[PDB]
Write a structure and sequence with these properties.
This is part of a larger assembly, with 2 copies of chain A (54 residues).
Chain A lengths: L18 E9 L9 E9 L9
Antiparallel strand pairs in A: 1-2
Subunit structure (chain B): Interacts with DSP, PKP2 and JUP. Interacts with DSG3; the interaction may limit the interaction of DSC3 with p38MAPK family members and therefore repress p38MAPK signaling activation.
Organism (chain B): Homo sapiens
Subcellular location (chain B): Cell membrane; Cell junction, Desmosome
């Protein structure tokens, strides 16, 4: 209903992967069959937290 | 919308040789009513990497 995006997993590490892609659509007619539809992408940048010690 | 198939950036015969890619079709309502097409795609070679003294 709102197009707020969330995570579902804690399986993230910037020391390995620093970007994602995710593919998304909006559609009218409350998503029914003749609801017209338009598609986009978004990218998710991962920022760093201090989890490696020196 | 037309199935024209392109590459986004330059490759190197130095680095790569060949690539296998699947093409497929999908409906807007989220289903796959027919078989996929495997593609075969080769990188071609020129002398373009210089000689270099050891």
């Amino acid at each position: 209903t709102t197009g707020v995006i969330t995570t579902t997993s804690s399986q993230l590490d910037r020391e390995l992967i620093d970007k994602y892609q995710l593919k998304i659509k909006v559609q009218d007619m409350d998503g029914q069959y003749f609801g017209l539809q338009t598609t986009s992408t978004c990218i998710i940048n991962i920022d760093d937290v201090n989890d490696h010690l020196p | 919308d037309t199935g024209n198939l392109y590459c986004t950036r330059p490759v190197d015969r130095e680095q790569y040789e060949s690539f296998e890619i699947i093409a497929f079709a999908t409906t807007p309502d989220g289903y796959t009513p027919e078989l996929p097409l495997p593609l075969i795609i080769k990188i071609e070679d020129e002398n373009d990497n210089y000689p270099i003294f050891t």
